[PDB]
Structures are given as C-alpha cells and as structure tokens.
Ligand binder design. Structure first.
Ligand SMILES: *C(=N)N(Cc1cccc(Cl)c1F)N(C)C(=O)[C@H](Cc1ccccc1)NC(=O)OCc1ccccc1
Ligand SMILES: *C(=N)N(Cc1cccc(Cl)c1F)N(C)C(=O)[C@H](Cc1ccccc1)NC(=O)OCc1ccccc1
Lengths: 305, 305
C-alpha cells in the first residue's frame, strides 16, 4: 500500500503566511488573529547580529519600519512587542482565515510539517523531526526565516517551530511560537554548534514495523534480546536509549504485526552490528529515524482532517 | 541551506477533494467547477472487476447510486458520463473554490505532488515521480483511490494524475485527468506487471548538482567522459540513456556550479562502478532519481506561488 514521508495538508497554514520587511531585511511572518509573529532578528542589520541588544535595538523601531504584506494587501501595525526571540506585531485586521490553533513546544524525537516560504509566499511543504540535539534537517534558503513547522491534531493547527538560524554545520535551529529556542541556541552571530546528533531509536523501530507492514521482512531474525542488552549496542552506535515507555508506545505496532518489541530490537541489533549487506528497507540503504510511531500508525490506517 | 523532497502547498487542492460512494465502495473525487471526477471502477463490485464491461455496468447506474459528499455537505448529481477510465459526475453546485487549473499528461521522469485522501478528506502531501515504467512509488491505502497528483505552474494547478491501482508488485498506477492510464495498465483485476524500472539519469545528475550546491563534493573526480562512453555504463546499470537534450536541460545547473555536465557524468560513472564506500550524498546511501532539474533549481533559488 506504500509508506512515504508525507506532510500534513498545508491549506490551513498557507493563508497565515505574510511578508515582513525591516530596513533591508525581508522574511516571513505568521498572522493569527490580529498578531503577526516573526523572528526578532528581522530588526538587526548583518552587523548588529555580532552582538545584538535586542531591547535597545527595538526602542529605535517605529511601526513605520515594519512593513507587513499579505500577498499584495498591506497590513497596519498598531504596536510591536517582543516575547523572547519573536516579535509580536499587533495589526488592526484580524486574519479572516485564522484556523483553530495552539502553540505547542514539541519534544526531541517528534515530527512536524514545515511550510517553507520566501517573502511571505509558501514554496513547499515537507516533514522534519526535532533531532535529539534540538536541530532539524530542513531546506531553508535566504528569505526562509519565519517559516513555521506544525502538526494538525484533529481540528487544531499546533504550531511548534519557527525558523531562525542555520548552523555553520548546515543544520537548522529555531524557536517555538513563544520565542524560546529549541536547544542551547542564541540569535547572535557567534560560535555555536550542534551537540552530538544521536539516532531516535523508538522511531527506527516504528520504521522497521512500517517496513514489516509493507512486505519488507528480510531483517526479522530468530534472535531476541532484553532492554539492558540492546541498550548496550545502542549506546555504542550513538543511538538513543530505549526506555520501557518507548516499548509501551510501540504497543499498537507490535500488536498489528505480531512481533514483540524486543524481537524487533533483536533485528535492529543485527542491522547495527552487521549492516544491510546491500539490501534496502522501504527503499533506503540507511536506517530512518524521522518517523514516529504515530506517523506510522497514521499512515498504516487512514487518519484524515 | 538544505535540500529536501518537498511537495507544493496543497491548499488550492484540498478544497477540491470530495467523497464518492457507489454501493459498498467509497473513494475520493475531484470537484472542479460543476463536475466531480473519480475513477470509474467505483461502480464495480469486487467481483465485477475480474472482467468489467464498464459501459454496460454504467447503464445500470442511477445518479441515486452516486452519493457525493463535500466534507459534510452533500452534492446533487444531475448527470453521469464516462471519459475513458474516469467518471464525470455533473453536479449543480460549482465549487466556489475551483482554482485556475489545467489537465496535463506528464512525461516519464517528471515529478508531481500527491495529496493523499481517505473518504474525501486530505491526509497528507508528498512528492512522486512518474517512473520510466509509468508507475509511481507512493502511499495509497484503502479509500485512497481518487487522490490526485498535481504541479503548481505559476498561478495554475496542473492536475496530472489520479490514483486507480496498486500493482501486486507494490507500486501504483493511475490515469491523467482525462482518464487515460499512464503505461499499459487496465482497470481490470487481471495479471499485469510493471516493466523494468530504469533509473532517471538526468534527475540523478540534477541531484548530484543539488549536492554540490549543498557542500557535498567528495564525488567530484578529475576524470571526464563523452556521452557515448557514459551511456555504455548507464545501459549496464539499467539507467536511462542520457541525450543531448538532457545535457541542455542541465545547462543552468552546470552554470551555477561551474561543473560541465559531462564532468558530472564522469562522477556518476565512478559511483555506479565503485559505489559509495559507505559515504552519503545529501544524506542518502543511494542515488536519488526523483528530483528533476526543475525541482532542484526551484529549491536552490526560491520560487513561490
Ligand atoms: C533567514 N532569513 N535566514 C537567511 C539565511 C538562509 C540560509 C542560509 C543563511 Cl547563511 C542565511 F543567512 N537566516 C538563517 C538568517 O537570517 C540567520 C540570522 C542569524 C545570524 C546569526 C545568528 C543567528 C541568526 N543567519 C544565519 O543563521 O546565518 C548563519 C550563521 C549562524 C550563526 C553564526 C554565523 C552564521
Ligand atoms: C482504491 N480505493 N484502492 C483500494 C486499495 C488500496 C491499497 C491496496 C489495495 Cl489491494 C487496494 F484495493 N485500489 C487500489 C483499488 O480499489 C484497486 C481497484 C482495481 C482492482 C483491480 C484492477 C484495477 C483496479 N485495487 C487494486 O489495485 O488491487 C490490487 C490488484 C491489482 C490488479 C490485480 C489484482 C489486484
């Protein structure tokens, strides 16, 4: 039936993306109700970034310096405040398309859809995971700051990410919609690097279950294992420790496939130790860790919105 | 800056997806203006499929057997015709959300976005390619038939695919929005199989250019090559022949990176002959052929909608 990395439908979010310009910098904003949220470093010049005192820099800001544009319409700014690392630009016009929404701070290992935009016009949509080191592997060019990541939980858009930064290592850092960075990152042009990027073990197992459900089963072994034993091989290969909570989460997948979680851990142990010998699982020559158990069950059932 | 497999924003298409039920079967339809397009095998029972005479089967169809549903609203059927392998269900209500659109029949090797739906509610969005053997590798569960693939060309939604079939080999077959299957496939429950799936050579090179643009450059060699010579190694590995037109298409990528196309072909030759030796390009251990030169330039510039 198939298994692919897919994003949520982005309709509800498209009509929330505006353009924000401050001086010579232009990036994306998120317009919900009468507020436009964007990264506060829109007010810095390439030189301010080396050591910004955002509060002082913000004193020098008139609403007139903030030119917000919804496609072609231009919006009115009747105030501007700062919440952590995001600017809250109050406007008079409530977005007639504001969806039911929450702001959620997601956990490392969880996934969201990113709607990439350039100058307030959506460009594409793709799925990301919040790595254990609080980075994401996305596609953000110049003009992409302000793009948001989100999940559609039932009838509600849960905003969880706004793009701010590219690390000189080529990965991406950002904040929740309250302006708190994920990870130890600061919006200053200084030496910062991502910590060791470990692999999300619970997700790899959900992917191996997704593979079993889709006929790929050459990795299923007769061996079995215990949590403690498996977590030794995991630590060796910079894999995340597998807790009992993680096994409980894989319950429904174990039930559907008829393969105890610890039996799947036995298969993963051998793949880490011996490799794929040139076979592929669901089309990859590598172990995939950016599907949650919930991404899998969702795709192997048929949940809609 | 990043390179990811991303779909077009699906907002314009979401509000075009309805639910169609005929008897015991329910699948998705596409409602543009006053017409609902869906796969004609919605009228067959699991038994009719072994040898359907769709024209006769359609005689026995009253509009009353066709229950169309837009989310919760129910639509009126004032006629029903058949164009090749798609039913055109005329309704009285024009979709107030019909976007500017064309119906395009895409070429093998080109990509489109699929909006997967289950019972007329969109589930997710992902990018596919039309393989050289006129199949696609997607994610279509029960209830997914009728989901469409599309490209957003400027201001126009170009519909190019509607899902009909899963081959017993696990790949997917479907039609253009005029009801003509891609490939030699028929909507009958009989022995049919996909031909040899060759690799889209022009796309792999666009991906290797995308990789160079993103700092991955360990594959760039001093060797060079000619078209004829390279196409010998390609044929060997079930790769598509590279024409001069394909080299002209890679022009803009060659220009941006400063690497003649034939020099990139020299790199691909060595990767096919020797393998990756455990390195990765843009995060894959395998050569990716589902990005067109246009998908790449689009992501390495910043084209929006
Ligand atoms: C957002 N509009 N955007 C522009 C952008 C996009 C892709 C790559 C780069 Cl290099 C780029 F500038 N971003 C990511 C930025 O404007 C940020 C702003 C910033 C700068 C410094 C610290 C925090 C935020 N630019 C950025 O991340 O540049 C890379 C960088 C990061 C840290 C230290 C030096 C350089
Ligand atoms: C669409 N609603 N859908 C249901 C569906 C989804 C995933 C897997 C399967 Cl097996 C499945 F049935 N499809 C793909 C179908 O309804 C088609 C209808 C059909 C049947 C036979 C020939 C053409 C079209 N089912 C299908 O492709 O089943 C697989 C198959 C194909 C060919 C021969 C035998 C079986």
């Amino acid at each position: 039936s198939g298994f692919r990395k897919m994003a949520f439908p982005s309709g509800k979010v498209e009509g929330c993306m505006v353009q924000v310009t401050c001086g010579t910098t232009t990036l994306n904003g998120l317009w919900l109700d009468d507020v436009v949220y964007c990264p506060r470093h829109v007010i810095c010049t390439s030189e301010d970034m080396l050591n910004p005192n955002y509060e002082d820099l913000l004193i020098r800001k008139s609403n007139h310096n903030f030119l917000v544009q919804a496609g072609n319409v231009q919006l009115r700014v009747i105030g501007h405040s700062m919440q952590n690392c995001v600017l809250k630009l109050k406007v008079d016009t409530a977005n007639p398309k504001t969806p039911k929404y929450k702001f959620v701070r997601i956990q490392p290992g969880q996934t969201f859809s990113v709607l990439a935009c350039y100058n307030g016009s959506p460009s594409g949509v793709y799925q990301c995971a919040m790595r254990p080191n609080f980075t994401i592997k996305g596609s953000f060019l110049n003009g992409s700051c302000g793009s948001v990541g989100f999940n559609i939980d039932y009838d509600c858009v849960s905003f969880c990410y706004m793009h701010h930064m590219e690390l000189p290592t080529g990965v991406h850092a950002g904040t929740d919609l309250e302006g708190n960075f994920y990870g130890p990152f600061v919006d200053r042009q200084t030496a910062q690097a991502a910590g060791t990027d470990t692999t999300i073990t619970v997700n790899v197992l959900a992917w191996l279950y997704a593979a079993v459900i889709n006929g790929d089963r050459w990795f299923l072994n007769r061996f079995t294992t215990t949590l403690n034993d498996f977590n030794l091989v995991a630590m060796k290969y910079n894999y995340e420790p597998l807790t009992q909570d993680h096994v409980d989460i894989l319950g429904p997948l174990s039930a559907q496939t008829g393969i105890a979680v610890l039996d799947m851990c036995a298969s993963l142990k051998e793949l880490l130790q011996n490799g794929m010998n040139g076979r592929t699982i669901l089309g990859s020559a590598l172990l995939e860790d950016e599907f949650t158990p919930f991404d899998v069950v969702r795709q192997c059932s048929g949940v809609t919105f």
